[PDB]
Amino acid sequence: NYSERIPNNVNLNENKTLQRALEQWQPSFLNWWDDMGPENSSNYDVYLRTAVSVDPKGWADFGYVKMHDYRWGIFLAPQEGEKKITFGEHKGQDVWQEVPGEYRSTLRRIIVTQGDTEPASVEQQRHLGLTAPSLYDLRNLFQVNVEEGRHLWAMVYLLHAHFGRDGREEGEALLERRSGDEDNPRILTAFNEKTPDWLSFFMFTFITDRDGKFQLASLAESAFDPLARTCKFMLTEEAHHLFVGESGIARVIQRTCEVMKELGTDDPAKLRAAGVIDLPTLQKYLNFHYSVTSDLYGAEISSNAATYYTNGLKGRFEEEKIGDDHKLQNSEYEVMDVAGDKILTRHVPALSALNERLRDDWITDVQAGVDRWNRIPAKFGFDFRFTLPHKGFHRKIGMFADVHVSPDGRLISEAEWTHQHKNWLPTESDRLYVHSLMGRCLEPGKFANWIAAPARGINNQPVNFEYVRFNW
Numbered sequence: 095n096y097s098e099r100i101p102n103n104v105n106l107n108e109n110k111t112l113q114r115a116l117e118q119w120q121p122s123f124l125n126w127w128d129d130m131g132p133e134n135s136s137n138y139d140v141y142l143r144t145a146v147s148v149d150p151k152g153w154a155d156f157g158y159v160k161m162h163d164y165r166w167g168i169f170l171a172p173q174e175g176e177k178k179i180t181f182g183e184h185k186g187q188d189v190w191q192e193v194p195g196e197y198r199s200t201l202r203r204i205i206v207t208q209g210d211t212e213p214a215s216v217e218q219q220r221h222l223g224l225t226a227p228s229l230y231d232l233r234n235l236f237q238v239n240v241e242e243g244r245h246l247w248a249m250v251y252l253l254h255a256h257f258g259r260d261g262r263e264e265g266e267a268l269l270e271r272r273s274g275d276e277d278n279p280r281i282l283t284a285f286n287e288k289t290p291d292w293l294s295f296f297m298f299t300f301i302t303d304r305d306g307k308f309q310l311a312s313l314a315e316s317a318f319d320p321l322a323r324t325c326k327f328m329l330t331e332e333a334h335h336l337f338v339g340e341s342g343i344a345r346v347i348q349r350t351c352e353v354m355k356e357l358g359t360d361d362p363a364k365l366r367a368a369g370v371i372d373l374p375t376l377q378k379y380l381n382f383h384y385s386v387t388s389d390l391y392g393a394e395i396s397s398n399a400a401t402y403y404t405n406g407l408k409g410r411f412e413e414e415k416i417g418d419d420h421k422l423q424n425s426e427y428e429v430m431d432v433a434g435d436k437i438l439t440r441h442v443p444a445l446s447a448l449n450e451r452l453r454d455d456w457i458t459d460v461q462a463g464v465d466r467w468n469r470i471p472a473k474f475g476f477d478f479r480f481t482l483p484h485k486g487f488h489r490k491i492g493m494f495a496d497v498h499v500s501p502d503g504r505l506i507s508e509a510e511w512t513h514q515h516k517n518w519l520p521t522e523s524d525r526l527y528v529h530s531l532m533g534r535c536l537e538p539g540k541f542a543n544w545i546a547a548p549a550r551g552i553n554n555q556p557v558n559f560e561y562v563r564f565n566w
């Protein structure tokens with residue numbers, strides 16, 4: 095009987111039924127945010143960006159707000175006159191403003207899946223704030239959290255506007271599942287794991303948000319133009335999430351590098367006696383997050399992924415730049431093949447291999463970031479370089495699900511895996527050591543010993559700016 099205004103650029107107030115249904119959902123979102131959102135944050139004033147438009151020349155306001163009061167809203171890319179579908183059997187036909195009946199349940203399931211990862215990530219990350227290495231980093235965490243939240247609103251809008259009764263019902267159930275719960279877990283495995291320390295947070299935003307970039311880019315070409323327009327704008331916001339992850343780790347590497355030079359050493363035990371995260375341990379964290387995330391792209395060879403492209407529901411990454419016929423009935427793609435005791439390659443029909451193409455696009459983007467990290471050790475004259483493990487290492491989805499592959503690409507026995515994987519994935523004692531460094535640091539402009547200062551602040555504010563005010 096008091097209803098918050100929902101900001102949007104979709105003219106929500108013109109469609110009273112849709113406005114009332116979303117208002118009916120809002121209090122439940124707020125209840126979920128208060129219980130599963132960032133712990134103890136109810137009174138904090140945080141310096142945050144809030145979307146107020148979709149102009150690529152200034153679409154966000156920056157100012158202090160309490161997160162429970164954050165102005166979540168619905169923002170789609172601008173509609174385009176007579177926009178056409180650009181791939182699949184529907185190529186050249188007009189885009190859709192409502193979902194065709196034959197595609198309803200598939201498109202709904204895609205949209206639900208995407209929506210579910212959003213509150214999941216917040217649930218995984220809600221305790222991080224208590225051990226934040228700086229007010230800068232606490233603010234970045236919170237910004238990622240409020241945006242995760244807006245991405246739930248984004249999908250819930252679509253479910254209500256375009257999927258009828260079950261759409262409403264999906265929206266409620268999106269707040270009823272919980273990451274790691276035994277009875278109602280979240281949908282994807284990776285979104286039921288713990289994010290137990292800030293090193294994992296930075297790797298998750300560097301690597302796992304990037305799956306989000308590539309899935310969202312694929313949906314941004316959807317023939318279902320309301321979904322396309324939603325996803326286009328989500329990609330604009332997700333770029334900052336990828337920067338938090340990439341620069342986080344860069345900053346850890348820098349610090350470790352600094353201490354290697356100052357102590358004149360390489361010895362991990364001496365480096366840990368100084369409270370830095372040694373580069374080989376970092377490499378295991380990269381191995382873990384990379385491999386686990388890679389599974390999210392799905393089976394390398396897939397009939398479903400074929401139908402999603404042919405039917406026009408999900409494009410390829412940067413579909414419009416690709417120089418083929420955008421239908422693919424006579425196209426090929428090269429994938430791996432487990433060939434007895436060897437890993438070989440083989441060509442398969444392109445339509446059947448779309449999940450592998452998207453995985454490969456994602457690998458290339460991760461490698462470009464890893465190349466940028468490796469400038470730091472090079473700067474210092476150190477030999478160490480970060481690498482990506484072979485794509486079959488530590489997989490549970492697809493052709494490698496049942497075998498073991500070492501980071502360097504060898505098929506290995508079950509016993510070689512049990513005795514060697516400690517060199518490749520974080521051990522219990524690695525995880526304990528990383529955890530022992532996680533002390534909160536909250537005075538303006540001070541940074542915990544395990545991570546260097548960032549290059550600049552946020553929204554032209556200084557590095558020492560009071561980015562969270564606590565009202566203790």
Ligand SMILES: CC(C)(COP(=O)(O)OP(=O)(O)OC[C@H]1O[C@@H](n2cnc3c(N)ncnc32)[C@H](O)[C@@H]1OP(=O)(O)O)[C@@H](O)C(=O)NCCC(=O)NCCSC(=O)c1ccccc1
Pocket residue numbers: 204205207208211212215242302303304305306307309310390391392393395396397398399408449491
């Ligand atoms: C492409 C996927 C990912 C998977 O497609 P599907 O069709 O479901 O699966 P396939 O194409 O692999 O199916 C091939 C076949 O393999 C079968 N199979 C066997 N075992 C399994 C098994 N154990 N598990 C699964 N499948 C298994 C399967 O049944 C099928 O069998 P048949 O061939 O019929 O015999 C789809 O979910 C999609 O487009 N999602 C939308 C985008 C999305 O995910 N967005 C989230 C991005 S993150 C982000 O936003 C964010 C990040 C950080 C913070 C916040 C946010």
Ligand SMILES: [Cl-]
Pocket residue numbers: 199202203206
């Ligand atoms: Cl569904």
Ligand SMILES: [Cl-]
Pocket residue numbers: 506507508509
């Ligand atoms: Cl074996």
Ligand SMILES: [Fe+3]
Pocket residue numbers: 212241242245306332
């Ligand atoms: Fe997101």
Ligand SMILES: [Fe+3]
Pocket residue numbers: 238242303306332335
């Ligand atoms: Fe994100």
